């Protein structure tokens, strides 16, 4: 037996073949890597903010407090 | 000019006379119409696509071209890439730069001669 060990020849072209795919810029991004402190703050400051429209029963809870 | 560094050996560019420009657009004139390749014959076409820019006429076209006025871009895209002919003069050497007696590069003024050979 004898073989060709590693060649990267055709792979670059193959990769450029259909273009290099880039992800979508999404206004709102996932929360990974963000600490819980800040996250709880967000949760609270959202729950209490009236200028942010909640669900009905939610607003009931918020308006009772 | 920088984007031409890479293609220098595959192409000749030059600085055309207005005369050349005209000749090109009369003999080799074709227009890009909603994707179609349309022979430049009437002016109705120049009005159709470029009319609102203030291009009513072949002569106008030639003018924004030669002046390179306010709308060059659309004046150009309007113009189908020119499908030329075999030069009557042979090319000299295609491996060589016009400088070595070859053809690849800017023949600054000289492009005209070439165009003349191809028209």
């Amino acid at each position: 037996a004898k073989s060709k060990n590693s060649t990267n020849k055709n792979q670059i072209s193959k990769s450029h073949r259909n273009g290099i795919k880039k992800p979508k810029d999404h206004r709102h991004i996932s929360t990974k890597g963000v600490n819980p402190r800040f996250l709880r703050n967000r949760r609270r400051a959202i729950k209490n903010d009236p200028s942010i429209k909640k669900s009905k029963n939610l607003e009931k809870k918020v308006n009772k407090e | 000019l920088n984007m031409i560094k890479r293609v220098l050996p595959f192409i000749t560019f030059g600085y055309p006379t207005r005369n050349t420009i005209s000749k090109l657009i009369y003999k080799r004139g074709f227009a890009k119409v909603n994707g179609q390749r349309i022979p430049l014959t009437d002016n109705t076409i120049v009005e159709k696509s470029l009319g609102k820019f203030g291009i009513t006429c072949v002569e106008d076209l030639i003018h924004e071209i030669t002046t390179v006025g306010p709308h060059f871009k659309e004046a150009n895209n309007f113009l189908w890439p020119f499908k030329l002919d075999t030069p009557r003069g042979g090319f000299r050497n295609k491996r060589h730069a016009y400088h070595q007696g070859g053809d690849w590069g800017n023949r600054e003024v000289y492009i005209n001669d070439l165009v003349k050979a191809m028209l």
Partner: protein
């Protein structure tokens, strides 16, 4: 390559710059970072914790989270012909602010100013920047230095 380890082939990239030995660099300690800022990421060898993988040295990321000792940044890596988002967490040490936005804001504000004033006068101002342009006609009156090609001489 027979060995693949977090620091492989890290020799001259991570060695401190000449005469940088033991520089504490208090400035990095004081730099303020905000969720939307653009950070440039640069490793220092004295500070071992929160070390990014060599690949990311000199990359420009966008900040995403802020932790007490560390800024979460965002970079992308081309992998098999596609881009993959990577969420980095860098200790303060290996991070510095990028001027890529600073330039932008400065420029913009000045430009906008100009346009507002012009709008006052009926003149439309354009902020579009044009690249190098073909040189305008010129007249030249000067002293002529006439050169002739030198003979060949051998200097030994």
């Amino acid at each position: 390559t027979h060995s693949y380890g977090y620091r492989r082939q890290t020799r001259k990239k991570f060695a401190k710059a000449y005469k940088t030995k033991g520089h504490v660099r208090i400035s990095r300690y004081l730099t303020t970072y905000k969720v939307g800022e653009y950070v440039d990421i640069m490793v220092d060898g004295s500070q071992h914790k929160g070390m990014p993988y060599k690949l990311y040295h000199g990359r420009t990321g966008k900040v995403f989270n802020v932790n007490p000792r560390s800024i979460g940044v965002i970079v992308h890596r081309i992998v098999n012909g596609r881009y993959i988002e990577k969420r980095l967490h860098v200790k303060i040490e290996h991070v510095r602010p990028s001027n890529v936005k600073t330039a932008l804001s400065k420029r913009y504000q000045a430009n906008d100013q100009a346009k507002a004033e012009g709008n006052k006068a009926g003149k439309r101002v354009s902020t579009k920047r044009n690249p190098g342009q073909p040189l305008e006609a010129v007249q030249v009156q000067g002293a002529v230095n006439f050169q002739h090609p030198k003979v060949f001489r051998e200097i030994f």
